[PDB]
Design a protein around this ligand. Sequence first.
Ligand SMILES: [Zn+2]
Ligand SMILES: [Zn+2]
Lengths: 125, 125
Amino acid sequence: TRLRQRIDAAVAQFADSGLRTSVQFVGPLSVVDSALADQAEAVVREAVSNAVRHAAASTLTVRVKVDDDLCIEVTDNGRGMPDEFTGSGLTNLRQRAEQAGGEFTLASMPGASGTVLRWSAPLSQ
Amino acid sequence: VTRLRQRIDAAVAQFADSGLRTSVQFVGPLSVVDSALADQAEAVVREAVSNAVRHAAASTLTVRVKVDDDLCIEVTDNGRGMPDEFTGSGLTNLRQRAEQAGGEFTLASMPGASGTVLRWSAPLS
Ligand SMILES: [Zn+2]
Ligand SMILES: [Zn+2]
């Protein structure tokens, strides 16, 4: 499937050139089947593409962890921009979570002090 | 715990010329790396990143940290037209640390997209 490579590529391709990025892989990425890898790649593409430049320098931190399940967590320390992540990209993350029998959360810290997107799905379901 | 992941991210963010795009990637069990080697890894990243310059075109520095049989730190710079970049005393410093840690160092340059690759590695014990 080449999952690790596809995720690094999606980040390089889709992250606004004004953002710093950091991607960590944890656990056996090989354990992910081709259909779920397809989901994982699209999820990272959606999250990263929807990130925008902020008033100050900011980083998107992506963590892709395969352990009991597959867990993709994107942390954005950029502030403000209340419309960031709220549109069709969010529809698509929720739809992909539903297709995969998984879960999606978007959470924004006090006065928009950073945002976390977490998409998870069972490895087998 | 060494806080290796966080310290590498901070080294890049803090020491990269602010005109460069940065991308950090992590693979393997980072927690396995000892405190002394984590100290080395951090210093290697700061030195390498601090030596990157602005090119005539926009450019990206990608730092990949991989833990398997050994610790491997690869800095890829797609910038062109600065053949003096990364040569000089910063390279001696990297080679010195490689020698001290019982590891290897490579500096490779080629035409096209992966213009320069700096690779520093050291055994875990
Ligand atoms: Zn953002
Ligand atoms: Zn350069």
